[PDB]
Amino acid sequence: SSPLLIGDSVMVDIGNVFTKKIPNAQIDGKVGRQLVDATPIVKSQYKDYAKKGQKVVVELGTNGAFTKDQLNELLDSFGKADIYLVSIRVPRDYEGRINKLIYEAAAARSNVHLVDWYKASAGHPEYFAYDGIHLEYAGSKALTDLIVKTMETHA
């Protein structure tokens, strides 16, 4: 079945690279999307992805901070799906606090599988454009492969 990928400008950056690799992927990316605004979209549009055996990728936080309660509300809205939750790398004061939330949710939830982009990209300045937000094409290819590899192997 088709995986759902939902996120912010980072999802926009990787969406076509991802679809070329995984042709039936469903991409929902939006520049500037805040995590709290994803939950109403999931609850109203993506109920059929919130089921056992479905796969969803969550790519949020680069374009804005969120809280633990907000993240819990989004993760709960995906039900029994396997959720691939991507850590963020962005030159913002909230980066560490939000990644802590992401690591903690992946630790505590058996259906949340960490995609640790923060750690994987530590040695790769060439993945990041000068604004610290846009991924260079090489970064989008690398993040795509990292997500796919995580989905093929799980938590």
134 contributes a contact to Zn ion by CB under 5 A = yes
| CB 43, min distance to Zn ion, A | 27
Catalytic residue among 37, 116, 134, 145: 134
C-beta closer to Zn ion: residue 19 or 111: 19
- C-alpha 10, offset from chain centre: 8
Catalytic residue among 8, 9, 13, 82: 9
Residue 106 class from Cβ within 10 Å (0-12 exposed, 13-18 middle, 19+ buried)?
buried
Stretch of 43-51, 64-72, 86-94, 128-136 lying at the interface with Zn ion (CB under 5 A): 128-136
Q: Among this protein's residues, is 93 annotated catalytic? A: no
| CB 129, min distance to Zn ion, A | 7
**CA distance linking residue 143 with residue 137, whole number of Å:** 10
Stretch of 40-48, 74-82, 86-94, 131-139 lying at the interface with Zn ion (CB under 5 A): 131-139
Q: What are phi and psi of 86, to 5 degrees?
A: -95, 130
**CA distance linking residue 35 with residue 121, whole number of Å:** 22
Q: Among this protein's residues, is 124 annotated catalytic? A: no
Number of residues in contact with Zn ion under rule CB under 5 A:
2
Residues 80-99 contacting Zn ion, CB under 5 A: none
**CA distance linking residue 92 with residue 3, whole number of Å:** 30
Interface characters, 5-44, with Zn ion (x: CB under 5 A): --------x-------------------------------
Q: What is the DSSP string of 92-152?
A: STTHHHHHHHHHHHHHH-TTEEEE-HHHHTTT-GGGB-TTSSSBPHHHHHHHHHHHHHHHH
| Residue positions annotated with a catalytic role | 9, 131, 134
Which residues are near Zn ion by CB under 5 A?
13, 134
